[PDB]
Amino acid sequence: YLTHQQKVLRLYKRALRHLESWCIHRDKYRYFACLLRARFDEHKNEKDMVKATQLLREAEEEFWHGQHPQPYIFPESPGGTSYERYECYKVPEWCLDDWHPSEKAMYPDYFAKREQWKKLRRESWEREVKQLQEETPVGGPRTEALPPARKQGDLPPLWWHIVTRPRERPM
């Protein structure tokens, strides 16, 4: 979940982004950008949590009433005009295992070095499993954060599919 601090910062980022859409021009955005900041300062250091949550609750409703119906969205952000555009070009690395030997003859250096990564992953798997069994509580993990490599020569647990992922512009 989100503490009271986070729920206020997130409301602050959204308000400026939707405020930017209404203003369009850069000079006019700066004007109301400062006024919006001021309203967040005069209550910056309120002490009563109940009043603090009251202000946040009554600010969201104002935000909802005044939100732009069609806010600006970055091209590659969720809902943008370029979101997931290149998911059709992202092929996983295991697809190269099935290449015909004739094809691999055209990339000897690449497939001479690809085998080194495969050997590295294969040798380091057994240790990674141990690093998690001993460092995890009796029942099971209570969070999704993995532990780093606590020794030299050992790679972080669960690194293959976060390191070898397809590039954001595969082609």
Partner: protein, 459 residues
């Protein structure tokens, strides 16, 4: 028909006497020569049909069905090579024998001149089909599927046996040629109402008709690949062939007895097409699409117009090659991911480029994209049903909209999108699979150039 019956029988000695490593090659090579020689049945005349002997005759209706029937035996043997690779030698040869037997009973059924002979062979197809479903299925539901496929057919078939024998005692013969000249109008009475039901219920359980179709989503889904192909390609068309023949001696009673079945079929298209939009199993989606397509055949046959009979014949041939193609495509995924759920493997166009072209072509023919013979057959039925009643255009039109939805929903869900990350055994497509699909679509697209050879006797 001895030039086709006897060679089919010789496929049995060939399979058993061949080497251990050449059963699939000898069976597939000679099953393609029998298919090649089946084109000689195309010697049809505008006035008269071919009447080889007292037993067997072939006309413009049975000829295309024979050619399709003799063209699936090679394809069924190609599709079955993989999932029977680690199988005992003798059981593989018994499996091939069952398919050969099924063809033999099928090329004698479509040519039997005497209706009771047509009945014996029409029923003989249950035995090999039942054994294929129950012995070489993969799931637990294959045993419960055979009973449904067996007792639904027999429930309506036995009443047909009594009705046929009654007709011979009255008329004096069952030879189909004689019944063209000795047929008499059916007087309207409670006795003739039940002779109409008995003479037509056996065939309407095999189409299948909506309401009586519960056996099909089980048998097609739970059968092996070869069983599904013949079940949906040639065995659903025994009902169509029978009705096109038995309706000769049921006039004029068919003019008012057809109402309950037309409404079931017209309203069954929409119910079954809608069911496809919410199917989690990919092989079950294809099965429910056969019930929706075969409901147009039922309406075309029951209204008895020259256009409808032409449309029904084309639809049966077109649906035979399209349903079979879809079953093979789905099985290709099954042999890799070992599951039938449609949402398990996605984004297969980025992993199997050329296999996504077959999916597109199969889907386009399914939704009747012109000028494919699917559209020609489906179009002729709508033209005839419009003259029957202008209001049927609403129901036919809505079924076209829903048909495109599930045809493309199947394509988008499985081929497009993002691939499943954890599935890393999707190997490149084999030459067997690519050739297997190419022997479905190519004949299906070549028939558009000369459609008259699949348009039936009324052409």
């Amino acid at each position: 028909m001895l030039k086709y019956i006897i060679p089919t029988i010789m496929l049995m000695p060939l399979t058993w006497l061949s080497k251990n490593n050449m059963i699939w090659v000898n069976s597939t090579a000679h099953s393609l020569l029998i298919s090649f020689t089946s084109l000689l049945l195309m010697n049809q005349f505008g006035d008269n049909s071919l009447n080889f002997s007292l037993l067997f005759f072939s006309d413009s209706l049975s000829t295309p069905l024979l050619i399709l029937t003799m063209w699936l035996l090679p394809l069924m043997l190609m599709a079955s090579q993989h999932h029977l690779s680690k199988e005992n030698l003798t059981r593989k040869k018994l499996f091939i024998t069952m398919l050969i037997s099924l063809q033999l009973f099928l090329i004698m059924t479509f040519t039997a001149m005497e209706l009771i002979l047509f009945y014996i062979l029409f029923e003989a197809t249950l035995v090999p089909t039942l054994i294929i479903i129950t012995r070489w299925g993969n799931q637990t539901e294959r045993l419960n599927a055979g009973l449904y496929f067996l007792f639904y057919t027999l429930a309506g078939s036995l009443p047909l046996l009594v009705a046929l024998i009654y007709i011979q005692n009255t008329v004096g013969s069952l030879n189909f040629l004689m019944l063209q000249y000795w047929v008499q109008p059916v007087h309207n009475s409670w006795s003739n109402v039940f002779m109409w039901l008995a003479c037509m219920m056996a065939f309407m359980v095999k189409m299948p008709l909506y309401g009586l179709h519960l056996w099909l989503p089980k048998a097609h889904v739970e059968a092996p690949i070869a069983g599904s192909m013949v079940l949906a390609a040639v065995l659903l068309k025994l009902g169509g062939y029978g009705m096109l023949r038995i309706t000769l001696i049921l006039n004029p009673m068919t003019d008012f007895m057809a109402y309950p079945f037309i409404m079931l079929s017209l309203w069954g298209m929409i119910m079954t097409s809608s069911i496809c939009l919410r199917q989690t199993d990919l092989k079950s989606l294809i099965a429910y699409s056969s019930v929706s397509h075969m409901a147009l055949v039922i309406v075309a046959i029951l209204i008895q117009t020259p256009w409808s009979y032409m449309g029904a014949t084309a639809l049966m041939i077109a649906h035979g090659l399209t349903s079979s193609m879809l079953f093979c495509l789905a099985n290709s995924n099954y042999e890799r991911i070992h599951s039938r759920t449609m949402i398990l493997a996605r984004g297969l166009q980025t992993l199997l480029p050329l296999m996504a072209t077959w999916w597109l072509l199969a889907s386009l023919t399914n939704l009747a994209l012109p000028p494919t013979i699917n559209l020609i057959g489906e179009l002729f039925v709508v033209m005839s049903t419009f003259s029957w009643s202008n209001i049927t255009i609403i129901l036919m039109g809505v079924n076209m909209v829903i048909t495109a939805l599930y045809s493309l929903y199947m394509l988008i869900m499985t081929q497009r999108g993002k691939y499943t990350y954890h599935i890393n055994n999707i190997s490149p497509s084999f030459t067997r699979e690519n050739a297997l699909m190419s022997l479905h679509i190519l004949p299906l697209l070549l028939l558009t150039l000369n459609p008259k050879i699949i348009l039936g006797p009324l052409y």
